Design a protein around this ligand. Structure first.
Ligand SMILES: O=C(O)CCC(=O)C(=O)O
Ligand SMILES: O=Cc1c[nH]c(=O)[nH]c1=O
Ligand code: NI
Length: 334
């Protein structure tokens, strides 16, 4: 069985490149080999690249084109569909500078004044039919005609992909192939469109510590990350260094989130990542587009150790928790 050359192999960080069609269409031997490679990637790096996924390259290109049209909207039009609450987790956001006020404590005035917010904007789309949380869609006029149908379409295709990656994890684990289905069939996921504007390289010297997206771990089961060719995504190695996650054409970068890490009793890794300047020298960095589809267990799901991830009960690291409650706590914290 032929393994691909690793997508990343640096400083102890080995991110495998895996042909997903071999899980979806292989004979039983190839299917199991591929599933095990998928799992093993999650257990070690917490990240994998997938190629030959069921989402077609020209549709993905159309989705990026559609997202680029949204972000070209005037500022007033984007704020109209602004992010509201952690409970909804839907709409437009652009991080601003914190302000010094009467309430501010003198100890951190220096820090507030010197802080540099992430140079990015985002628009988040949840599933259409979640009770009490409608998506704030922009008006379908001119270039945004077709925006909703395209993004809903993409949402459902990523939703299907999530279900399939979890099946690969289950197969790799040697548990029931369909174990995760009833934990993820609702599709309580979040489609985050990202635009990192063109920025002069010097902004990064004027604001030291300035990034495009701050270091973090994702919250959910897995995240499907579709990046353009610009570069800048970095993943933390076992040795504590950020390593470039080079774009590879027509791949999806897939990482486990904090909930899956906990769910798996820490047999699966949720790995710190960030977006910085592209590794390339240049006076101006062009606009960078990515799309992060955050996958989650159903909000109603109760999360406790998956079978086969511990031997004795004393090996269980975590109390069971409700999935929905956990996520709102992560989203509301800041
Ligand atoms: O834009 C990227 O490449 C990564 C974004 C990301 O990690 C996130 O939104 O959680
Ligand atoms: O960037 C992290 C995340 C942000 N928003 C979410 O809904 N899930 C995440 O994992
Ligand atoms: Ni992330």
């Amino acid at each position: 069985g032929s393994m691909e050359k690793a997508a990343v192999n640096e400083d102890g960080l080995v991110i495998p490149l895996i042909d997903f069609s071999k899980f979806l269409e292989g004979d039983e031997t190839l299917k199991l080999e591929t599933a095990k490679a998928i799992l093993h990637g999650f257990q070690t790096a917490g990240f994998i690249y997938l190629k030959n996924i069921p989402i077609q390259p020209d549709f993905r290109e159309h989705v990026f084109n559609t997202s680029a049209k949204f972000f070209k909207l005037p500022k007033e039009k984007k704020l109209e569909v602004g992010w509201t609450t952690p409970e909804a987790n839907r709409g437009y956001s652009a991080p601003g500078r914190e302000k010094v006020t009467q309430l501010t404590d003198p100890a951190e005035i220096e820090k507030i004044r010197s802080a540099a917010p992430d140079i990015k904007e985002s628009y988040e789309i949840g599933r259409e039919d979640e009770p009490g949380h409608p998506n704030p869609w922009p008006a379908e006029q001119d270039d945004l005609v077709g925006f909703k149908s395209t993004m809903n379409n993409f949402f459902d295709q990523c939703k299907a992909l999530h279900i399939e990656v979890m099946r690969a994890i289950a197969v790799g684990m040697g548990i029931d192939a369909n174990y995760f289905d009833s934990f993820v069939d609702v599709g309580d996921n979040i489609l985050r469109l990202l635009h990192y504007p063109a920025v002069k390289s010097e902004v990064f010297k004027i604001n030291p510590g300035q990034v495009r997206a701050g270091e973090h771990t994702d919250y959910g089961s897995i995240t499907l990350l579709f990046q353009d060719s610009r570069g800048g995504l970095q993943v933390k190695s076992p040795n504590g260094q950020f390593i470039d996650a080079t774009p590879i054409e027509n791949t999806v970068v897939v990482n486990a989130g904090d909930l899956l890490a906990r769910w798996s009793n820490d047999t699966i890794k949720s790995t710190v990542h960030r977006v910085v300047e592209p590794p390339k020298q240049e006076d101006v960095h062009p606009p960078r587009y990515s799309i992060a589809y955050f996958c989650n267990p159903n909000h109603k799901s109760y999360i406790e150790a998956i079978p086969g991830t511990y031997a004795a009960e004393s090996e269980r690291k975590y109390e069971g928790i409700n999935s929905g409650k956990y996520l709102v706590q992560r989203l509301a914290a800041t």
